Short mmCIF file of C-alpha atoms in Angstrom, two decimals:
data_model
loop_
_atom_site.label_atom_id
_atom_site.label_comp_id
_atom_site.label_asym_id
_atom_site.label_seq_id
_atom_site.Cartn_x
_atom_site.Cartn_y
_atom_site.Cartn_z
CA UNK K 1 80.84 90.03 66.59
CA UNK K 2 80.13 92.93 68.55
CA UNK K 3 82.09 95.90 68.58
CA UNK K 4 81.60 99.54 70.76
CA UNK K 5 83.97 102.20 70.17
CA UNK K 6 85.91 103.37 73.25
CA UNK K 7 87.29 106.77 74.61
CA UNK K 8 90.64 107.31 73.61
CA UNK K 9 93.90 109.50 74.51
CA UNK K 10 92.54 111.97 76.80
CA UNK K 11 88.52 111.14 76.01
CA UNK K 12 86.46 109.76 78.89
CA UNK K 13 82.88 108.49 79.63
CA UNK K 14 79.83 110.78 80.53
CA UNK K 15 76.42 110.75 81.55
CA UNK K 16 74.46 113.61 79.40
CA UNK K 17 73.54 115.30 82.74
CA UNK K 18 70.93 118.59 81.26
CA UNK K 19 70.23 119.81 77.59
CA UNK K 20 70.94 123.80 78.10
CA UNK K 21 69.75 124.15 74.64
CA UNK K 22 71.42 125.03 71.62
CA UNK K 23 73.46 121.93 70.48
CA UNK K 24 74.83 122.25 74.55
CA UNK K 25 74.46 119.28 76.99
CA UNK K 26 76.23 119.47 80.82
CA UNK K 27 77.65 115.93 80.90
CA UNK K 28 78.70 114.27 84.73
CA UNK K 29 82.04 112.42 83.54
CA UNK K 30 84.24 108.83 84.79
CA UNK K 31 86.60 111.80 86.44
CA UNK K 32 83.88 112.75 88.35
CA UNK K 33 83.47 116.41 86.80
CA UNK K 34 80.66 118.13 85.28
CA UNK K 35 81.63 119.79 81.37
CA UNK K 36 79.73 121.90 79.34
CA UNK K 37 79.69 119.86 75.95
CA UNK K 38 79.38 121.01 72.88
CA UNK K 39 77.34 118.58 70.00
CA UNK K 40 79.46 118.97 66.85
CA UNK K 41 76.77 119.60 64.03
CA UNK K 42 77.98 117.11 62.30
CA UNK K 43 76.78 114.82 64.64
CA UNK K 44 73.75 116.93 65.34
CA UNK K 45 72.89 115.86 62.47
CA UNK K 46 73.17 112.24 62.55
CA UNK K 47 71.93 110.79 66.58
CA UNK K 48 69.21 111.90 69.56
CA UNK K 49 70.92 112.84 71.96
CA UNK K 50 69.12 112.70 75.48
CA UNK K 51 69.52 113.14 78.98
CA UNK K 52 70.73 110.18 80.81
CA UNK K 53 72.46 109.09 77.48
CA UNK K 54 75.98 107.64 77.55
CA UNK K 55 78.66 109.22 75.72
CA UNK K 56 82.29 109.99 74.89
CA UNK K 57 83.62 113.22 75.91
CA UNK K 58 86.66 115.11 74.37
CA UNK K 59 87.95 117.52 77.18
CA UNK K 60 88.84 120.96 75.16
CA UNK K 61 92.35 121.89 75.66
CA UNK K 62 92.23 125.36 77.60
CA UNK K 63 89.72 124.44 80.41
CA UNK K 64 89.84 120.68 80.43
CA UNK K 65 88.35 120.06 83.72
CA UNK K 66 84.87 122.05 82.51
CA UNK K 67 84.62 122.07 78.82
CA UNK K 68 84.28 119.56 76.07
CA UNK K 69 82.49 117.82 73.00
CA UNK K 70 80.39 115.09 72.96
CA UNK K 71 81.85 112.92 70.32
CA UNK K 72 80.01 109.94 70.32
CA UNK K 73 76.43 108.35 71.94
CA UNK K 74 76.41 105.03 72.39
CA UNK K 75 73.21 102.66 72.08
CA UNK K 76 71.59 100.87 74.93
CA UNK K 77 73.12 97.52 73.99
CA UNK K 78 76.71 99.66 73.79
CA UNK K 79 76.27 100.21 77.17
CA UNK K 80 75.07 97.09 78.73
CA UNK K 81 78.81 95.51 76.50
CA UNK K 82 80.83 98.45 78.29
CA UNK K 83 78.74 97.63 81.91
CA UNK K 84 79.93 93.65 81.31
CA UNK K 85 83.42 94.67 80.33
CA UNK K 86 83.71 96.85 83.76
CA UNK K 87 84.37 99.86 81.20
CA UNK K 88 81.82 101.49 83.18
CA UNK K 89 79.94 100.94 86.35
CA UNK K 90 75.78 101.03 87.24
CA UNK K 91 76.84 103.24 90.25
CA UNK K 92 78.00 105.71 87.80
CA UNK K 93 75.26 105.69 84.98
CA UNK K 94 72.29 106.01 87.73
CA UNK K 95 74.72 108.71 89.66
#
C-alpha cells in the first residue's frame, strides 16, 4: 500500500528551482511563484535535497507570496503516484 504525504492547509507543491547556498533553495511553486525556502536543519539533516527535486512548501506568514520552508522532498516514485493522481502535472515539473 503506497502512501505520499500531501501539502496541507496553506502548503503547496514546488520545484527546487536554484541552491543559493546555505540551507536556501529558490523553489518555482503550483501558484506559479518563485519563494526563497528555507531547509529546516532538522531536515538538513535527514534528505539531499537537489535542484529539480519535488517538494512541499510552507509559505511564511508575513511575505507569503516570496518566502517559505521546504518541509518535505519527495522520492522519485512519490512523484510519479502524485503525476498519476493529477496532484501534479509534467508541464509543471519540467517548467
Amino acid at each position: 500500500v503506497i502512501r505520499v504525504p500531501l501539502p496541507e492547509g496553506n502548503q503547496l507543491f514546488g520545484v527546487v528551482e536554484q541552491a543559493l547556498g546555505a540551507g536556501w533553495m529558490d523553489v518555482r511553486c503550483e501558484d506559479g511563484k518563485i519563494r526563497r525556502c528555507r531547509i529546516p536543519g532538522k531536515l538538513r539533516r535527514r534528505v539531499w535535497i537537489r535542484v529539480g527535486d519535488l517538494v512541499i512548501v510552507q509559505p511564511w506568514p508575513v511575505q507569503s507570496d516570496k518566502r517559505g520552508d521546504i518541509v518535505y522532498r519527495y522520492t522519485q516514485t512519490q512523484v510519479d503516484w502524485l503525476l498519476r493522481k493529477g496532484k501534479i502535472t509534467q508541464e509543471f515539473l519540467t517548467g
